C-alpha cells in the first residue's frame, strides 16, 4: 500500500477524451435565461468544443488517469 | 559453435570436444546489458540498515527557550532545534529497501552474455562424482591441479549434482564455487577466473539459453 | 553513510591563504577576510594588466616628446611623428623612447634624416 494519485472528480465530470485522444468540454450558458438568447446563439452553445490549449496543463494535472494525446 | 571446448577425464587427458551456444547480446549493448544485470544484483543484495532520528524522534524536547545552559548542547536564551548538537538529523537515512526490478528476459540475457564471454576459459569434465567417497579436501585439490586450476585464482564448478563428498570436499577452498543450477548467479560467473562444466551441465545451459 | 567534511575545507582555505601572504594585518590572518582580499587582488591584477598597456604608451610618448623638444625651437612630439609617417618609417613608440634614453645620438640622426627629406 503506497499512495496512488487521485482523480480530481470535479474535473472528470466536466472534461473527457475523444477516441483520437483530444480533450473536450461542454459550452457554458444554456441552463436558464434562454428566452432572451437568440436561437442561433442557443445552437452555438449546445456543441462540444476542444479545450483551449492554454488550459490543458491544469486540466491534465488534475486528471492523471485520462489517456491523452497532445500530438507529439 | 565458433569454438570448441576441451573435455578432460579425471586424469587430465583430453577425451573430447563440446559446443556451448547461447543467446548473446548484440555486440553494441552487451557491456550495458551485463552491467545493468550486475548493478541490479548488487543493489538488491543491499540491506538498508542505516537509521537516524528525525527531529521528532530525538529524546526529550519541550517547546520553550532553555532555562539553563547545557554545556555543549545549548546556551541560556536559545530555542530548541536541529541546529544544536544532539538535535535531530535533517534528511538523514531511514531504513529502506533498495529493491529494484529488471525484466526476466533481460536478466537471462545478461547471464548468457557473461557465460558466452567465458568460453575462452572454460573446460568440461567427465563427471567425477564417484571418485569421492570419504570427503577429502586434499584429494579435490589434487584433482584441480591435474586439470590446471591454480588453487588461488577463483574458479567456478558448475555441475548438476551435489554429491555430499564433493560438496564437503570443496567447502573449504575460498576460490571455488560449486554451483547447482539452483544457485547460479551472474555475479559468480563474472567473478570467476576459470569456468568448469560437466557434460550434463553443458546440455542444460545450451538448452535453457539456446539460440534458435 | 555519514560523511564529515574533513580536510576538503582546510585545503581550499590553506591554498587561498598562500595567496594572501604579505597582506598587512588581518588580511593575512582571518580566512573570511582573506577570501575577499584574494578576489580583489586578482581583480586589480586583471585590471592593471590592461592599464599597463595604456600607461607605458603614456610614458614613452612623454619621453619622446622631451627628447625631441631639445633640437628645434618649434619642434614637437606631434610634428616629429607626422614626419616619421610621411617618411615611411615603422619604428614604434617603445623603440623611440628606448633609443631616446639609451642611444641619444641615434635619435639625433633620425631627426636629421627626417629634416633632410622634409627639406
Amino acid at each position: 500500500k503506497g499512495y496512488k494519485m487521485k482523480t480530481h472528480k470535479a474535473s472528470a465530470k466536466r472534461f473527457r477524451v475523444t477516441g483520437k485522444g483530444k480533450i473536450v468540454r461542454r459550452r457554458a450558458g444554456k441552463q436558464h435565461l434562454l428566452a432572451k438568447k437568440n436561437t442561433k446563439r442557443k445552437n452555438r452553445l449546445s456543441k462540444l468544443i476542444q479545450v483551449d490549449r492554454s488550459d490543458y496543463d491544469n486540466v491534465i494535472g488534475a486528471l492523471p488517469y485520462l489517456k491523452v494525446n497532445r500530438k507529439v | 559453435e565458433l569454438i570448441p571446448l576441451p573435455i578432460l577425464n579425471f586424469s587430465g587427458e583430453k577425451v573430447g570436444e563440446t559446443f556451448l551456444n547461447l543467446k548473446t547480446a548484440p555486440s553494441e549493448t552487451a557491456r550495458a546489458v551485463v552491467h545493468r544485470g550486475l548493478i541490479t544484483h548488487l543493489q538488491n543484495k543491499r540491506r538498508g540498515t542505516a537509521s537516524t532520528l528525525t527531529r521528532a524522534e530525538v529524546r526529550g524536547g519541550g517547546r520553550k527557550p532553555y532555562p539553563q545552559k547545557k554545556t555543549g548542547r545549548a546556551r541560556r536564551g536559545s530555542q530548541r532545534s536541529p541546529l544544536r548538537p544532539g538535535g535531530g538529523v535533517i534528511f538523514g537515512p531511514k531504513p529502506r529497501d533498495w529493491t529494484i526490478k529488471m525484466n526476466k528476459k533481460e536478466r537471462r540475457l545478461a547471464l548468457s552474455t557473461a557465460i558466452a564471454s567465458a568460453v575462452g576459459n572454460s573446460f568440461v569434465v567427465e563427471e567425477f562424482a564417484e571418485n569421492f567417497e570419504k570427503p577429502k579436501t586434499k584429494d579435490f585439490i589434487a584433482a584441480m591441479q591435474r586439470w590446471g586450476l591454480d588453487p588461488a585464482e577463483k574458479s567456478l564448478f558448475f555441475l548438476m549434482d551435489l554429491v555430499e563428498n564433493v560438496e564437503k570436499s570443496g567447502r573449504n577452498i575460498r576460490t571455488l564455487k560449486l554451483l547447482t543450477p539452483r544457485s547460479l548467479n551472474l555475479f559468480d560467473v563474472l567473478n570467476a577466473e576459470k569456468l568448469v562444466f560437466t557434460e550434463g551441465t553443458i546440455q542444460y545451459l545450451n538448452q535453457r539459453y539456446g539460440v534458435d | 553513510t555519514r560523511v564529515k567534511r574533513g580536510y576538503i575545507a582546510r585545503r581550499r582555505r590553506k591554498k587561498i591563504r598562500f595567496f594572501a601572504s604579505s597582506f598587512r594585518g588581518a588580511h593575512s590572518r582571518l580566512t573570511r577576510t582573506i577570501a575577499q582580499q584574494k578576489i580583489r587582488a586578482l581583480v586589480s591584477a586583471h585590471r592593471d594588466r590592461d592599464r599597463q598597456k595604456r600607461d607605458f604608451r603614456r610614458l614613452w610618448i612623454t619621453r619622446i616628446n622631451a627628447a625631441i623638444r631639445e633640437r628645434g625651437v618649434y619642434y614637437n612630439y606631434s610634428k616629429f611623428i607626422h614626419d616619421l609617417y610621411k617618411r615611411q618609417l615603422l619604428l614604434n613608440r617603445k623603440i623611440l623612447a628606448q633609443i631616446a634614453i639609451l642611444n641619444p645620438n641615434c635619435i639625433y640622426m633620425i631627426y636629421n634624416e627626417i629634416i633632410k627629406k622634409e627639406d
Binding site: 480530481h8 472534461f15 473527457r16 441552463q31 491544469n58 486540466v59 | 557491456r31 552491467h35 564471454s117 575462452g120 | -
Partner: protein, 185 residues
C-alpha cells in the same frame, strides 16, 4: 573481450547525473535554486491546488458538467469484445477451424482482462476474409454476417443467458404470440 566486474560500465546516456540544488552558483541552481525571488511558489511546503487559478472561478468550475454523468445516469460500458475480420485474416486459421472465443485466446489476438473475461464476443465487418471458417459468437454486425455468408462461412450464434421472467409476464408475451398465430392461420 571477456566480462569481469571491472570492464563493466553503463551505456552513454543511460544514467544521467542528478541536479543537486543549493550547491554553489557556478554549478547550477544555487542560492534560490531556480525559484527566483520570493512569494508562494518559492516557499517550502504543499503548493496550491493544481486546478486553482488565483481565486478567479477555475476553468473546471465555470463549465457545465458532462451530459449523462452530471445526473447519475450510469456511464456507458463496452458489452462485447469487438473483433473485425482483419484480425481473423492475419491469424493462422486453416479451413474448417473453429474461431469461437477460446481459439482467439489460444492464438493470443485477444488478451481479455477481468471485465473482458466475463464478456461475450461480437464480430464486426472490416477487411475481406478469404477462407471457409466455422464461427461461434454471441452477435454479429449486419455487414459482418453479410460478408461471412458471402464467403461461405457457417455462423453459429450462441445462446445468451436466459432472463428470468415471472409467470404472469409469460402469459402476456404468449397471449401476444397466440394472437398473431390465430390471425395469420
Amino acid at each position: 573481450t571477456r566480462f569481469r566486474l571491472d570492464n563493466l560500465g553503463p551505456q552513454p546516456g543511460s544514467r544521467k547525473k542528478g541536479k543537486r540544488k543549493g550547491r554553489g552558483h557556478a554549478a547550477g541552481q544555487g542560492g534560490s535554486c531556480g525559484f527566483g525571488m520570493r512569494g508562494q511558489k518559492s516557499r517550502s511546503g504543499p503548493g496550491i491546488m493544481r486546478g486553482f487559478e488565483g481565486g478567479q472561478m477555475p476553468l473546471y468550475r465555470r463549465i457545465p458538467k458532462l451530459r449523462g454523468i452530471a445526473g447519475g445516469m450510469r456511464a456507458g460500458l463496452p458489452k462485447y469484445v469487438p473483433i473485425n475480420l482483419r484480425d481473423i485474416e492475419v491469424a493462422g486459421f486453416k479451413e474448417g477451424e473453429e474461431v469461437s472465443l477460446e481459439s482467439l485466446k489460444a492464438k493470443g489476438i485477444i488478451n481479455p482482462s477481468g471485465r473482458e473475461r466475463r464478456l461475450p464476443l461480437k464480430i464486426l465487418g472490416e477487411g475481406e476474409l478469404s477462407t471457409k471458417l466455422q464461427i461461434k459468437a454471441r452477435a454479429f454486425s449486419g455487414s459482418a454476417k453479410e460478408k461471412l455468408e458471402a464467403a461461405g462461412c457457417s455462423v453459429t450464434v450462441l445462446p445468451g443467458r436466459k432472463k428470468y421472467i415471472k409467470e404472469s409476464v409469460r402469459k402476456n408475451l404468449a397471449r401476444a404470440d397466440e394472437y398473431f398465430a390465430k390471425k395469420r392461420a
